């Protein structure tokens, strides 16, 4: 899942986005957010 | 021969022995925990080299944390 970085964000650079995915294991549910281009 | 001794290119290195756990600082070194006393002592021996040392008590495997210090 691909979410473009808000252009007014401190970490905005052209083409930058957050790649967000949901995971779940024995313990529970969580989300990971990694910056990509 | 039931004490650690050099044996170059041994098929039974300390490294694979269940009684061994790595040295706290330098992973090239090892700790022999084989000498276990009836009163609970684990009387370790320091291993200078875990690739070329062995003894007759060698047993391949891995102890759980419960059985180590």
């Amino acid at each position: 899942n691909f979410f473009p970085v808000p252009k007014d964000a401190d970490d905005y650079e052209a083409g930058k986005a957050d790649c967000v995915r949901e995971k779940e294991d024995e313990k529970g549910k969580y989300w990971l957010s990694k910056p990509i281009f | 021969q039931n004490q650690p001794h050099t044996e170059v290119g041994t098929a039974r290195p300390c490294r694979s022995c269940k009684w061994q756990t790595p040295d706290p600082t330098d992973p090239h070194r090892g700790q022999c925990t084989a000498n276990r006393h009836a009163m609970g002592g684990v009387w370790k021996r320091w291993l200078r080299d875990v690739e070329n040392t062995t003894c007759s008590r060698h047993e391949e495997g891995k102890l759980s944390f419960r059985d180590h210090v």
């Binding site: 957050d18 990694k34 | 992973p27 320091w46």
Partner: protein, 857 residues
């Protein structure tokens, strides 16, 4: 059960009548009460990352590679740039590119690796530690990249920088961790007291604006006619440091806000419940403002504190600990939220819940520390020690409703970490003392108790040695916390301890004693020369000769212990700059100095561990070899080399010789001198980087187990490889035969040349859980305080329950016990360690004990 005292019959029946019939061996499985459904959920699914015996308990816990990867990328790209700026760029790259993590039910958010089951590694510190990880089941992956990374860093590592300045034979001796703890530069282990107060009060945006102002002024200074080259060049290092601070702070803000944005994204795209959606947006907003802006409420403060913790303890650099004065730190924000309701309005119980969540996040904080330090804190993630209570600048009670919220949260949620230290003063309100006791009587092992006045006085004394005459003021000296388990240090916006190189690290009297009797040669563990050749057995013709041999062994060892720390300090400030920590220290910011370079408050110490084994051995040597001449030293030495086999009658003689902790004159006279003249007296001759003395902080953590296993048989009666004493000044397990107040009387005799000393005691469960528990305990503490004893901490746990937990660990998950300076999940401790805790004497109180304590019922 029943005791007669001052013409009354005391009945030791439990306060909760239900406990009359609950089996003794399962008591602690009944005591947790998480304040909310959420925190109950959070505990049940808690991602514990406990380590014992050098390994992680759970197969799922494994190393991350992102921090390694991004630090390396930045380092290659920043070649040629000033080192402080290179460090800031490194941190920034890590923060900019890191995968961030959000978990279900969380309110306090954030993490320090790319996955909630992971932890980061530190190739810039110890190349050996990384290599050990590569050889483990929990290696970072891909292994080939990680290996390539470690090879890149090796010539640049802190370890590689420091080693050339010491005799290699000396390093080999230290690295064994038998007579000396390995130097921090070789393991990467470390500690810190973050200036949390600065972040919460000012926010990072203000720090940035401030550094920028310093830079502009400095550049202006350098272009002013007429130039003075003996002054103007000072601006170079300052400008480098300030520019580094700005880079670091901007990256932290960006990282915090990106965490916030993940909350927003999950709320809008992943979370289906409108309740959680609203909460996630609430969290997202906090992360947007904080820590960029000053905190306004308790929720702000908690998240600010957690973010700061992550940078200072995990991301910028590894540091053990959780040092902070949490009640005093959070009070202004508690007051704003709970009392005045001015921002982020909350109930007291809301505050209690927030602290529970904090405890659970810390419980999930896995530590990328080296093998040794996965050995010596069994049953825990790491050391996390926070401080509460004590006195304020005017010497009045510092306890408050935030203190109580912190204590109740601990009692309710029952996590082994973080541990708590309570600074005890006669000023302290009873309402808060009762909460302290609620935690102790439930067997948590904490709060441990520190003598408030001793610590405050200590801060004043060290302050006198300040190299720039800006040590703690008399009022500031009241602002102190334990750095890790045991040693006091200043907290606040300035003058806090920035590195373990200042103070910390251990030395091992028991092993030093053993080799004293063998001309410095360690025949039993390493089979090599471990110390100086202080004299063969025949040269030891009197007890004084034995005493002097140990002294020289101790002098040789302690010199290496401090000098290796000071050399590390030299290079840390030159190549391991911490620009974020610098930016939030008022002194560093003002002076344009790195956190490791500037040292306004000296706090030098080293940890004697396994002291009482050494001490009892010497007592026994004196009585049986030299006074009574029942055995010659050759007879003793032959017996020792045999592990007492064939010599059981001799062993039993030495075992029954007078022992520490019995208020016995013969033992205590020798051992008091041992503490004061040698352990403290010799160490105190050394001056560290900061220009103050180095004094001993007696403790043990799990080293009393590991060093024990590396120490041969000793004249106190140990077989080879048996555990050492459990504290800095505890009686050896099972040798205190005169009751709890006899112990206090022994311990109180050590008064000179100490920085601190850890005392473990174990109290009878029925008495402590009875309605008379608080009065007896409060009387115990008052008496302990009057005797001017530095420290005490308590186990309150039946042997029955511990044995049951050995047989059936899966039925005893919530059993928590005190080890030494920290608490642990009992079933996560190896059997060897478990048995040492069971062997600790459970103390009952006689009527004479109670009279001594001046108990009133």
């Amino acid at each position: 059960k029943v005791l007669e005292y001052k013409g009354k019959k005391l009945n030791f029946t439990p306060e909760d009548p239900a406990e009359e019939t609950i089996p003794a061996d399962e008591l602690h499985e009944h005591l947790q009460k998480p304040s909310t459904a959420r925190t109950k959920r959070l505990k049940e699914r808690c991602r514990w990352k406990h380590a014992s015996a050098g390994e992680f308990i759970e197969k799922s816990v494994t190393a991350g590679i992102e921090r390694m990867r991004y630090l390396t990328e930045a380092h290659k790209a920043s070649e040629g740039k000033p080192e402080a700026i290179r460090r800031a760029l490194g941190l920034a790259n890590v923060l900019n590119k890191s995968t961030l993590v959000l978990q279900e039910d969380e309110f306090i958010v954030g993490y320090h690796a790319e996955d909630p089951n992971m932890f980061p590694l530190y190739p810039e510190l110890s190349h050996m530690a990384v290599q050990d990880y590569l050889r483990s089941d929990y290696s970072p992956q891909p292994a080939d990249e990680a290996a390539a990374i470690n090879e890149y860093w090796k010539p640049h590592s802190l370890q590689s920088k420091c080693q050339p300045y010491f005799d290699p034979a000396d390093l080999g001796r230290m690295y064994q961790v038998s007579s000396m703890e390995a130097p921090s530069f070789a393991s990467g282990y470390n500690s810190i007291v973050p200036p949390y107060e600065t972040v919460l009060e000012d926010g990072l945006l203000a720090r940035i604006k401030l550094a920028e102002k310093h830079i502009a002024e400095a550049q202006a200074d350098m272009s002013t006619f007429p130039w003075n080259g003996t002054k103007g060049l000072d601006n170079i290092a300052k400008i480098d440091n300030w520019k580094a601070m700005v880079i670091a702070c901007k990256a932290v803000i960006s990282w915090a806000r990106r965490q916030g944005r993940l909350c927003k994204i999950v709320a809008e795209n992943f979370e289906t419940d409108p309740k959680r959606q609203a909460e996630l947006l609430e969290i997202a907003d906090i992360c947007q403002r904080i820590p960029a802006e000053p905190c306004k409420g308790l929720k702000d403060a908690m998240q600010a504190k957690f973010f700061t913790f992550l940078i200072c303890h995990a991301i910028e650099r590894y540091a053990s600990g959780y040092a902070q004065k949490e009640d005093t730190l959070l009070w202004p924000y508690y007051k704003a939220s709970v009392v005045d309701k001015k921002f982020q309005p909350m109930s007291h119980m809301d505050a209690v819940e927030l602290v529970e969540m904090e405890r659970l996040k810390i419980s999930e904080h896995g530590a990328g520390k080296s093998r040794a330090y996965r050995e010596i804190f069994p049953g825990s993630n790491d050391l996390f020690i926070l401080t509460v209570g004590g006195t304020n600048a005017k010497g009045e009670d510092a306890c408050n409703d935030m203190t109580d919220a912190i204590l109740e949260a601990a009692k309710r949620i029952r996590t082994a970490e973080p541990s708590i230290v309570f600074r005890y003063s006669k000023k302290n309100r009873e309402k808060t003392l009762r909460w302290v006791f609620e935690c102790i009587r439930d067997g948590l092992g904490y709060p441990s108790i520190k003598h408030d006045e001793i610590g405050t006085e200590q801060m004043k004394e060290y302050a006198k040695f300040s190299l720039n005459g800006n040590g703690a003021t008399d009022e500031e000296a009241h602002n102190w916390v334990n750095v890790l388990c045991m040693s006091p240090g200043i907290h606040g916006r300035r003058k806090t301890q920035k590195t373990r190189s200042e103070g910390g690290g251990s030395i091992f009297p028991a092993k030093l004693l053993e080799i004293s009797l063998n001309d410095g040669y360690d025949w039993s563990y390493a089979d090599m020369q471990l110390g100086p050749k202080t004299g063969d057995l025949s040269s030891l013709k009197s007890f004084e000769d034995v005493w002097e041999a140990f002294r020289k062994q101790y002098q040789y060892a302690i010199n290496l212990c401090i000098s290796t720390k000071d050399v590390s300090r030299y290079f840390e400030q030159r190549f391991l700059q911490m620009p974020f920590v610098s930016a939030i220290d008022d002194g560093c910011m003002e002076l344009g100095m790195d956190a490791c370079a500037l040292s306004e408050q000296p706090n030098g110490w080293h940890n004697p561990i396994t002291t009482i084994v050494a001490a009892n051995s010497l007592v026994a040597i004196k009585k049986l070899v030299f006074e009574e001449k029942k055995y010659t030293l050759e007879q003793l030495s032959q017996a020792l080399k045999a592990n007492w086999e064939g010599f059981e009658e001799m062993r039993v003689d030495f075992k029954r010789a007078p022992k520490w902790g019995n208020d016995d004159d013969y033992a205590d006279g020798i051992i008091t001198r041992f503490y004061e003249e040698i352990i403290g007296g010799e160490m105190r001759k050394i001056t560290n980087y900061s220009g103050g003395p180095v004094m001993p902080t007696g403790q043990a953590v799990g080293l009393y187990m590991e060093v024990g296993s590396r120490t041969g048989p000793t004249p106190d009666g140990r077989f080879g490889g048996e555990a050492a004493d459990d504290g800095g000044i505890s009686p050896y397990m099972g040798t205190d035969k005169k009751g709890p107040t006899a112990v206090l009387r022994s311990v109180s005799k050590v008064q000179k040349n100490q920085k601190g000393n850890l005392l473990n005691q174990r109290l009878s469960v029925p008495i402590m859980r009875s309605k008379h528990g608080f009065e007896i305990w409060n009387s115990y503490i008052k008496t302990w305080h009057d005797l001017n004893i530095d420290h005490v901490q308590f186990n309150v746990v039946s042997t029955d329950e511990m044995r049951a937990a050995q047989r059936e660990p899966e039925k005893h998950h919530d059993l928590i016990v005190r080890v030494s300076g920290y608490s642990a999940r009992f079933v996560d401790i190896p059997t060897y360690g478990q048995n040492t805790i069971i062997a600790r004497q459970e103390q009952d109180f006689s009527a004479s004990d109670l009279e001594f304590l001046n108990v009133e019922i």
